[PDB]
Design a binder for these strands. Structure first.
Ligand SMILES: [Mg+2]
Ligand SMILES: [Mg+2]
Ligand SMILES: [Mg+2]
Length: 217
RNA sequence: GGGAUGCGUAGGAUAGGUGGGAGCCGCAAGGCGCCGGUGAAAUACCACCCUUCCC
């Protein structure tokens, strides 16, 4: 454990209080920020890249891009993803730097049918890689609706070259208990992949534009 | 810790990074951002992690 429901709820409730969080012209998001000490990057001490489905659904859906198959096309549309790219539309993207880079930047997940895995990696890959993103395969079944929905509420817990973990934990209109639970999920995904309880320095939580609040331990 | 600092090319520009982000400051006017665009990467705003210097 890196934290506990109670200390997290304590911090989160404080991060959402008008004291630490002024009101804005949009529903802000809540973030979890974990920093680490004495961690050796080149040794895989804190190498992360975990897909984490949030237990308590936020009022803001994560942007998902989906490249289905004729069969899945309609089911994909149902899940109402950020954008649906048919296999034909994908081919036409080859060579188009701008549209591809846009797609890579304004989308969090890229779900590709196994038949377009190669196509997607060549056309979207070079744009996803540097952005810390990547494509993930869709199941071969026809109704993908649920899979997409799952990613519409999944966050990426990854590290690149800094001893820290920054993740979207939900929106500010949620109950501290719920945010605390998603925080747990993110936390559990870190522990699961690496024992860094001793390297942990601090854990902050905050709204998109509110003051950071350290979690007590 | 507080104040500074970071100059290939392209990008109205000295882009150290990353997460949040569709808004931010302002009575307003207006500025800034998104958008559009360039790029390997995007920039307001909120934060966290760095380089170098000062205290
Ligand atoms: Mg440069
Ligand atoms: Mg970003
Ligand atoms: Mg910056």
């Amino acid at each position: 454990m890196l934290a506990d429901k109670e200390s997290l709820i304590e911090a989160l409730k404080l991060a959402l209080s008008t004291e630490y969080n002024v009101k804005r012209n949009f529903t802000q998001s809540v973030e979890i920020i974990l920093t680490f000490k004495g961690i050796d990057m080149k040794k895989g001490d804190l190498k992360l890249r975990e897909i984490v489905p949030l237990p308590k659904q936020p009022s803001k859906a994560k942007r998902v891009l989906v490249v289905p198959s004729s069969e899945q096309l309609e089911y994909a549309k149902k899940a109402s993803p950020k954008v649906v790219i048919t296999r034909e539309e994908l081919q036409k993207l080859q060579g188009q730097k701008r549209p591809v880079k846009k797609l890579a930047r304004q989308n969090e997940w890229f779900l590709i049918n196994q038949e377009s895995m190669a196509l997607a990696g060549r056309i979207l890959g070079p744009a996803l890689g540097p952005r810390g993103k990547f494509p993930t395969p869709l199941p071969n079944t026809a109704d993908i609706s649920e899979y997409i929905n799952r990613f519409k509420r999944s966050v990426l817990v990854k590290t690149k070259d800094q001893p820290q973990v920054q993740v979207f934990i939900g929106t500010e209109d949620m109950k501290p208990e719920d945010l605390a639970e998603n925080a747990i999920a993110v936390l559990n995904a870190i522990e699961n992949k690496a024992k860094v309880e001793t390297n942990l320095r601090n854990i902050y939580v905050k709204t998109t534009m509110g003051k950071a609040v350290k979690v007590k331990r």
